[PDB]
Amino acid sequence: TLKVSNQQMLQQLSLVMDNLINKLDLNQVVPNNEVSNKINKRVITAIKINAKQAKHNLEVKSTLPI
């Protein structure tokens, strides 16, 4: 313009092992109806910015007289 140790590496890997073995409940992906509000607000604001930019993108017509 915090490097991780191999011990906690193996601990996290084994945590993913047991969490994949015991149950992969795919129903847990559903948001709790509050973070989804924030996610939708962020996405719609990004869409509003992009669409207001890309609403209007031979020369174009001018409001001026010739």
Partner 1 sequence: PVNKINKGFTLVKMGFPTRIFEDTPTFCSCHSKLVYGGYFCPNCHSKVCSL
Partner 2 sequence: SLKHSVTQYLEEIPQQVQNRLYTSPATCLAIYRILPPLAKFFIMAMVFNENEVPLLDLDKWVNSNGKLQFQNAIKSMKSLHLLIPNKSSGTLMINLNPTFKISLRNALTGGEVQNSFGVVVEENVVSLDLLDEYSANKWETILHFMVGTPLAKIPSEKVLNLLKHSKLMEEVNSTGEFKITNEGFQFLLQEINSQLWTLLLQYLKMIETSKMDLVDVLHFIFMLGALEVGKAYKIDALSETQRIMLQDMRDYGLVFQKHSNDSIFYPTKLALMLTSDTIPDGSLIVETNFKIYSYSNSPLQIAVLSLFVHLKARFVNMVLGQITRESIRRALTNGITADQIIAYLETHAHPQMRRLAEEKLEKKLELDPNCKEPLQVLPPTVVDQIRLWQLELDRVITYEGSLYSDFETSQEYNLLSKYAQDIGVLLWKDDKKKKFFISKEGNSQVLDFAKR
Partner 3 sequence: NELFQDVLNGDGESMSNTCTAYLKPVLNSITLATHKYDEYFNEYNN
**Size of interface with partner 2, in residues (CB under 8 A):** 16
Single out the segment in contact with partner 3 by CB under 8 A; choices: 9-17, 22-30, 38-46, 57-65.
57-65
Residue 11 or 50 having the CB closest to partner 2: 50
**Dihedral angle computed from the Cα positions of residues 15, 17, 18 and 23, in that order, rounded to the nearest 10 degrees:** 120
Q: What is the C-alpha separation between 53 and 37, in angstroms, rounded?
A: 24
Dihedral sign, Cα of residue 12, residue 16, residue 22, residue 28 = positive
Q: Tell me if 33 contacts partner 3 by CB under 8 A.
A: no
- Binds partner 3 (CB under 8 A): choice among 35, 58, 64, 66: 64
